[PDB]
Design a binder for this molecule. Structure first.
Ligand SMILES: Cn1cc(-c2ccc(=O)n(C)c2)c(COc2ccc(-c3ccc4ccccc4n3)cc2)n1
Ligand SMILES: [Mg+2]
Ligand SMILES: [Zn+2]
Length: 324
């Protein structure tokens, strides 16, 4: 049932040399991949090599993997390849900026997870599939997409000469699949709330054991979430336009409800175009900010996110107050 790259593709990738003027930008957290799509797969390669060295993965096997992923990403408005790479740029950006803090076995699993975390998004929400009534919410009951996202990671690696992690002990290979599993689950934004709760507390008290493997996992979780929402931390006009990407998908899904004579929540309702900056603001305030705060908290390097998170918020304010 899976989908796979061709010789042409992965050898085309294998060939890629990133242009020197980009080595500078890509290191900034606010960096936006949008203009340079051609390079998108190439870029992820660059970042693996910068993080994990050109000797962490068999290059043939890697490019093969990157592109087959690329194929299991649907041509949807927002939950698409462009997204996976944007997110995975952010996890990188993070990991570089906290270099001593994560194992080799960690940077890998994550940078990978970040690429895979929405594999085969059909553009609808968990709520959409659960509350009626896909063969996906018939088999995965909770975090539907998020486990599919992973079982879709799972299968990909199980494809011919794709298994990038063949160079590890069944104990490390199993370890990293379990690093991924968790890390990809983390992206169920619902889960972030109980997750960030703890992380506020264990900071408040200050009983947060970086040695404790279950504590540990949680920081990742927020990390994921942080990267997942990162579109908010790009410069105003990048964020501006990405908002229409989420809105296309949202309303598209609300239109599907409407076609059964069901009122979709005003978020997915396109006939409420105007309430958006109002909504967006709430989200920044209730969700984004508390998120990037607790982060900058645990990982002070991550400050520029929160800095730029605010700058956008500020702008949405303006747009409401009548100044855009
Ligand atoms: C799980 N999740 C990740 C993201 C997200 C959000 C923004 C963003 O830039 N990214 C990258 C990701 C979201 C919803 O974000 C939104 C949050 C809220 C609205 C909203 C809410 C209420 C509205 C009411 C009326 C009109 C428009 C309204 N609009 C839109 C998007 N849910
Ligand atoms: Mg997701
Ligand atoms: Zn996502």
């Amino acid at each position: 049932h899976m989908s796979i790259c061709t010789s042409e593709e992965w050898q085309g990738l294998m060939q890629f040399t990133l242009p020197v003027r980009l080595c500078k930008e890509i290191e900034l957290f606010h960096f936006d991949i949008g203009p340079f799509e051609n390079m998108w797969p190439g870029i992820f390669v660059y970042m693996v090599h910068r993080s994990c060295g050109t000797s962490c993965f068999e290059l043939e096997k890697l490019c093969r993997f990157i592109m087959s992923v690329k194929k299991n990403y649907r041509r949807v408005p927002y939950h698409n390849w462009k997204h996976a790479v944007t997110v995975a740029h952010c996890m990188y950006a993070i990991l570089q900026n906290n270099h001593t803090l994560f194992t080799d076995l960690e940077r890998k699993g994550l940078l990978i997870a970040c690429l895979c975390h929405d594999l085969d998004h059909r553009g609808f929400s968990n709520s959409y599939l659960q509350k009626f009534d896909h063969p996906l919410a018939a088999l995965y009951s909770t975090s539907t997409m998020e486990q599919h996202h992973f079982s879709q990671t799972v299968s990909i690696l199980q494809l011919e000469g794709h298994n990038i992690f063949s160079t590890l002990s069944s104990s490390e290979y199993e370890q990293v699949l379990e690093i991924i599993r968790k890390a990809i689950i983390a992206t169920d934004l619902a889960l972030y709330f109980g997750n960030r709760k703890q992380l506020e507390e264990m900071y408040q008290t200050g009983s947060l054991n970086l040695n404790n493997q279950s504590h540990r996992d949680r920081v990742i979780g927020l990390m994921m979430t942080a990267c997942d929402l990162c579109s908010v931390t790009k410069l105003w006009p990048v964020t501006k336009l990405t908002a229409n990407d989420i809105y296309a998908e949202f309303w598209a899904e609300g239109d599907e409800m409407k076609k059964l004579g069901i009122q979709p929540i005003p978020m997915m309702d396109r006939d409420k175009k105007d309430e958006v900056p109002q909504g967006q603001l709430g989200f920044y305030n209730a969700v984004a900010i508390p998120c990037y705060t607790t982060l900058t908290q645990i990982l002070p390097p991550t400050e520029p996110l929160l800095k730029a998170c605010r700058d956008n918020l500020s702008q949405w304010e303006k747009v409401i107050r009548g100044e855009e």
